[PDB]
Amino acid sequence: HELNERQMERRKNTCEILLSRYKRKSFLHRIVTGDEKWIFFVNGKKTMLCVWWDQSGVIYYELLKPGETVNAARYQQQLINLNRALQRKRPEYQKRQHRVIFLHDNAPSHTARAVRDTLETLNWEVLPHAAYSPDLAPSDYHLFASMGHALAEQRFDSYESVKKWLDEWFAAKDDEFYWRGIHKLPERWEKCVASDGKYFE
Numbered sequence: 001h002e003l004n005e006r007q008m009e010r011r012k013n014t015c016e017i018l019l020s021r022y023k024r025k026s027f028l029h030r031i032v033t034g035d036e037k038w039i040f041f042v043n044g045k046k047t048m049l050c051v052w053w054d055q056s057g058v059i060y061y062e063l064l065k066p067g068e069t070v071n072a073a074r075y076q077q078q079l080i081n082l083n084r085a086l087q088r089k090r091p092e093y094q095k096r097q098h099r100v101i102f103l104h105d106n107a108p109s110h111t112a113r114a115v116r117d118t119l120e121t122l123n124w125e126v127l128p129h130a131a132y133s134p135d136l137a138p139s140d141y142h143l144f145a146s147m148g149h150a151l152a153e154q155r156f157d158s159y160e161s162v163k164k165w166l167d168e169w170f171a172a173k174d175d176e177f178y179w180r181g182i183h184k185l186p187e188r189w190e191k192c193v194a195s196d197g198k199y200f201e
């Protein structure tokens with residue numbers, strides 16, 4: 001994708017804001033992030049992985065029934081279920097000592113009215129994210145980057161072989177892999193600013 005002027009300006013401006021905040025007070029340990037990816041399996045079928053994670057590991061994921069997509073109502077329900085997982089797996093959040101900072105992309109179901117309401121009610125801080133920026137999304141440049149290489153060697157048979165493969169694959173990564181993916185953010189933000197909003201190396 002060739003970025004246009006509007007897109008590069010939004011990327012640079014978003015990265016400046018995040019980087020300057022980071023420099024005043026790091027917030028990276030409070031980020032919960034997530035994204036969707038298709039995973040394919042032959043009987044020409046596919047299932048959507050929806051996953052959320054932080055520097056400690058995977059919090060919650062869903063594998064959708066073959067062919068089914070995330071819409072506004074599904075995403076709202078996912079966020080509610082994710083919050084239940086976060087309470088159970090992240091004590092700093094159950095106790096309200098620590099506000100969730102949520103990083104997701106601008107997919108329409110992510111910004112629909114009902115979802116925006118639900119995020120306000122959960123009262124997670126929603127981080128700015130520019131369009132066409134998977135290079136700035138940890139799920140894309142870290143998690144799915146690693147996962148995609150391993151996936152390419154699989155030939156899944158069933159929706160439940162996928163679920164087991166993901167359970168094992170997620171659990172086999174050490175805490176340090178998750179930590180690195182999140183703490184790569186500031187170096188990425190810096191590169192984007194130095195690129196003036198272009199894609200970078």
Ligand SMILES: Cc1nnc(C(=O)NC(C)(C)c2nc(C(=O)NCc3ccc(F)cc3)c(O)c(=O)n2C)o1
Nearest residue numbers: 001035036105106107108130131132133134137140
């Ligand atoms: C804008 C815009 N339009 N297409 C895109 C885009 O970024 N596409 C590509 C396939 C780069 C992409 N996309 C998403 C993603 O979620 N796409 C749905 C979405 C739609 C609109 C919107 F504003 C943001 C996101 C990924 O997660 C991802 O990894 N990639 C690689 O960005």
Ligand SMILES: [Mg+2]
Nearest residue numbers: 035036105107
């Ligand atoms: Mg996405």
Ligand SMILES: [Mg+2]
Nearest residue numbers: 035036134140
């Ligand atoms: Mg993505």
